[PDB]
């Protein structure tokens, strides 16, 4: 029942983490002694770039509204 399911999960996760440990050993050897990404399969720069793009020139927030809320407030405090 649940015991055999737990044993099956154990037998799966053992080979999972020993494969993981071999990958960490390989990367540690690579790092101390010295893998590349030159394709388009899963790259995360797109969403970061877009989220910066919209926040820089947001017509509600952006910079021009912030600079306006700075300088008109300074003019109100001065005049």
């Amino acid at each position: 029942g649940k015991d055999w399911h737990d044993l099956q999960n154990e037998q799966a996760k053992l080979n999972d983490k020993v494969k993981l440990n071999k990958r960490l050993n390989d990367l540690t050897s690579t790092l101390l002694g010295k893998d590349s990404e030159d394709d388009s399969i899963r790259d995360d720069s797109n969403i970061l770039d877009i989220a910066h793009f919209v926040d820089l020139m947001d017509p509600y927030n952006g910079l021009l509204k912030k600079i306006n809320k700075i300088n008109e407030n300074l003019s109100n405090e001065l005049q």
């Binding site: 969403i47 700075i70 300074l74």
Partner: protein, 203 residues
Amino acid sequence: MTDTYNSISNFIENELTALLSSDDYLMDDLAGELPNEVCRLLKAQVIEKRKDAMSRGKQDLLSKEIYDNESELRASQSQQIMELVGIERLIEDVLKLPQMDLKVLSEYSNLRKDLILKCQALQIGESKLSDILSQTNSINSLTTSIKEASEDDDISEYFATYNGKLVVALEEMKLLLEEAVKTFGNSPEKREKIKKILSELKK
């Protein structure tokens, strides 16, 4: 069916002969680096503890148990594949079908590989589309933002004249700051002006 178990039994006997030749390989490896009389003595302790460990009945019982496990593995394989004759359930049943009348077997293996490729590319494309959907959502939010902000529907030129509005706002800020510096000259007024300038600039 029983020929499979016969081949398992002959290979088990072959591996036992491999083990005894490996014991002889211990014997002639330890020769030279150890005295041969010491080698014969440790061979004697190997006989009186380790040689009887591979009993004749136990290896055959293990071979029979392995054959029964392989037969029930084949039965389970048949059960899943006959269930598979009849979206994520398809990819699941594909990744649990095993790997293997020579032409049918070769084409089964080849198209099995070519269909694991399709199953993998499925979640590859799914993750890519899940990213691009959020990208287009933010882009559409920005476009409707500038559309109903200016209420002029000329948003293509909005991204071209933003530099001019930016620099004239900076020039007005610079003129106001110069007027405040040359007019007020007070430490608390300058501190308050600097605090108000630096509050909403980044924070």
